[model samples]
Target chain A: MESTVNALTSELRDLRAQREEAAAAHAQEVRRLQEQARDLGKQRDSCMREAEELRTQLRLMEDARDGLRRELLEAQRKLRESQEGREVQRQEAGELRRSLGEGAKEREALRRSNEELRSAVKKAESERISLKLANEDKEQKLALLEEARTAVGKEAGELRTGLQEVERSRLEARRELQELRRQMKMLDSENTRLGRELAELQGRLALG
Target chain B: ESTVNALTSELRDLRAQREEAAAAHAQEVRRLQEQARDLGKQRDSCMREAEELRTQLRLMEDARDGLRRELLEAQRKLRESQEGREVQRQEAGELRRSLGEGAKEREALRRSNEELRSAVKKAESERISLKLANEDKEQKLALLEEARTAVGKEAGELRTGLQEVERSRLEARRELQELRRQMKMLDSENTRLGRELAELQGRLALGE
Candidate 1:
């Protein structure tokens, strides 16, 4: 009787030990999975924040580009005015030259008869002075137009470069997200495999 | 006989204990089964949430794709506008050259006029002494008339050329303005799409 009682006691103790071990292992796995979940959540949040910041910067760039476009339009309008002014100056210069030439011719004709027409010569001299002034004004306007065009070209180039940079960053971000997702899937599969092994271990322990 | 009775009593006790243990084990198994059921429920919920997250992620990807397309469109428009601006600048450069040439010609005319004026001044003083040199005066008059005719023809050609350049310049300026307007529209759409992508990314960061 004592032997039978002793045997039953020993078996009961062994089963309790096995159960305790299984419980401990299960608890540990639960804790580990919970920690992993927390860490993954944090990582996801950080990635999201980074993406949002990039987007905001992109939007700002777009706004700046819009403003630049408006500025370019204004610049174009100014260029038109400059072109018109140049044309008018050109016409006036031509007219001045014609008048100067006519006056010179008339003075010469008078000189042939009276060899010393002071008034005719004076009039031709003044016309030449006016033509010179008109020519100077036209040159100044041309220079201004050239400078303005250069400035506009430079601004457009800068905007294009900025847009390209933003696009590159966005593509990089997308690639990063894909990598993260692939890693996450790998981890999930690994966790699943570990869970199956844990179950098998529990079954072996129960039999033992 | 007494020993057998004691053994039998012990056997009865052992049987009752075994029965008790079996009940306890069954209860434990039931508790474990309940735990397993709860774990299964938790796993199912987790999988459902994960699936929902995946769906959300897909939606986010779609939104991001849309934004990318919009950005590409904006880039194309920008390139077109930039090309248009380049053309305008080229035309402006041509106009500048014409203006410079006209100024040079006007300077030459002014110099010629100054020489004629000086000659007239000298002739005025020497008129009484050179009254018999009438043939020399007639030759000088003919030379001045030829100079005047050449100047008049040059002036007419320059005026017509300047007018054509100015007309083309005005047309370029108008085209540039139109391009800028298109660019602005594209920029605005790009900005909006970027903002939407950012919002979607923000939501994706919240993984359950």
Candidate 2:
């Protein structure tokens, strides 16, 4: 009986030891898990802060983006105004071009008129030069007519002679030359203007 | 023999106490094991939560990065547009200044051109004639072309952002799948623990 009782006592002590071992192991496992949990929580907190900062930056970035869009739109408006201004200038350029066209036409007319005037002046000059000797010979006839007219002066200068040939032709040629000079005067003004207009057009074209 | 029977009775009592202690120890060990397992589960959940937060943080960082890039792009474009507008306005201001003359004033110049054209000298007459200037007006159109080219590049840059967004979508989908898998694991784990509790409670009532 003593032996049996001792076996039971021994078994009970072993069981106590087993329970103690189990409790110790459980405590150890809990400590390890808690340690891991602390590390994980720290990592999570870091993530939380990073995420918070990211969101904050994102919000401000969005605000700036929106404001920039508005600013770009305003720039678009200003660009349009600038474009309109360019168009207005373009219209002015067209007007200047038309004026230039008119000036060119005037240049053409000046060329033709000057050419005609030069021709007329040359012809009249040649005619006057060639008739100079003939005019000297005709002075005798003209003097005779003058003396005859003077004798008839008592009858109210009624003497009539055939004085309508060489002098008359000379007088007509002089009138033609004078008319050509008038034409040359008108043409010279246009030539001056043509040079002026072209220069002005060139200045405007280069000014831009 | 009577003394021997008395010893046997004591031995039996000792055995009974030992059995009770062994049962209590068994229960204690089971509780400790379960406590340790619970701590392990707590640690696992902490890890899972942290991982989830990490995913969120990654996604938030992507958003923030995207926003930052967008803001920077917008600022660049805004600066470009502003500078473009400034140049356009500068040119426009000069153009406006140059074009201060009236459009109708061109008529008078045109008449002058007509008058001058009829009078200009011969050799220079055709020299002053002008062709249509500048196709009448397209410098701003060139500006628009340049502007359009820049816009195309901007559009291309903006389009490149889509691939990152697509990657984000796939990331979110994978994270969702992971969460769903975790939910299934949690569900199955709860069922297993419930089964263990039912078995333990059955043993307790029977022991009573």
Candidate 3:
């Protein structure tokens, strides 16, 4: 019985030593794992922070890029408008130029027509007055000359009307030409403004 | 002897528990090691994503510079358009003066049939002057043609700018697609793995 008790005591002592060794080893491993976990956690945190910061920066870049796109779109819209306006002005100027040529030709025609009518009237008047003198005391022939004079005056009225028409046309053509000139100037001014605006946007984008 | 028996039983229990703790810790530690490896891959993917983002940003900046260059060219071309407009205005003023002169000459013919020969001479003056004005019209037409080409060049550049705008839009959409691949979720994955590790450690401690 005494040896048994001694054996048991010895075995318990050995078990205590084993338990202590195991505890120490387990503690060392746990400490090492914790150290590794701490570093991993820190690294994860760093990665997450970097990713989030990059995300924020990317979002801001997108916002800035969108803004630039909108401005450029607006500029393009205005440029199209300006181009269309200028195109119309060019066409109007072309038509007006053709009309100017036609107007000059018509006025020349009217001048020649008036000269022909003047010569006819003078010829008729001199012929009637000379015949009245040559046929002195002939009442019927004088009456005939009176009728001829009336017809010549009617033609003179027609000539006067033609001159008035030419004058009216000249005034109208001048006014239309001036109107187109103003419109063309306006379009140029608008185009210049668009250019200036685009330059400003360009500067902003460089700064951005 | 009873005391010895109890002590022996307790030592066996402790040894068994120590073995169990070792097994559990080893498994949990292996899982943590695996998680770390996965996290490394995750981090690599994140780095690549950011790299692509930077590449896309660079492309966007290059596109912006191209657009700015095009706009500057257009602006330079518009200068000729401005000069063209001013010259047209000068031509317009001359036309106004010529029209006024013709008006005065036409009015002179209205007064007298006796000095009509003199009037005929003035009519010739007006006609030739107006015909000369028609020649001026052709010159202004040519000037307008120059302006039209300038506007055409500007329009073409603006169209090019519009194409760039659409390209930027496409790039921005691609960037958004890149952003949609969330990296923040990776941080959460790490956190959950940490929670699992802690739970495994707590269980190992409790059983011991």
Highest DockQ scorer = 3
How would you encode candidate 2's per-residue C-alpha lDDT over B160-198 as one tens digit per residue? 544444455555556556655655655565565556556
lDDT of each: 0.57, 0.55, 0.62
**Per-residue CA lDDT of candidate 1, range B1-208, in tens?**
5655655565566556656755665565566556556555555555555555555555555555555565556555555555655665565566556556655655565556666677776655555334334434445545555554555555455456556555655565565566556556555655655565566546656742
> In model 2, where do residues sit more than 4 Å from their true spots?
A1-4, A118-208, B1-208
Instruction: Flag regions of model 3 displaced more than 4 Å.
Output: A1-10, A102-208, B2-6, B34-38, B63-86, B100-208
Task: Give the TM-score of candidate 1 (chain A).
Answer: 0.49
Interface C-alpha RMSD per candidate, 1 decimal: 68.4, 63.6, 65.6
Ranking by lDDT: 3, 1, 2
Ten contiguous residues minimizing lDDT sum, candidate 3 chain A? A132-141
Write the number of the candidate with greater TM-score, choosing between 2 and 3.
3
**Clashing residue pairs found in predicted model 3:** none
For model 3, the local distance difference test gives: 0.62
Winning model by lDDT: 3
lDDT against true structure, model 1: 0.57
Instruction: Judge the docking of candidate 1 as incorrect, acceptable, medium or high.
Output: incorrect
- Candidate 1, A116-178: lDDT as tens digits: 444667665565565556545655555555565565555545655655565565556555555
| Residue B144, model 3, lDDT | 53
lDDT of 3 at A23: 74
RMSD of 3: 77.0
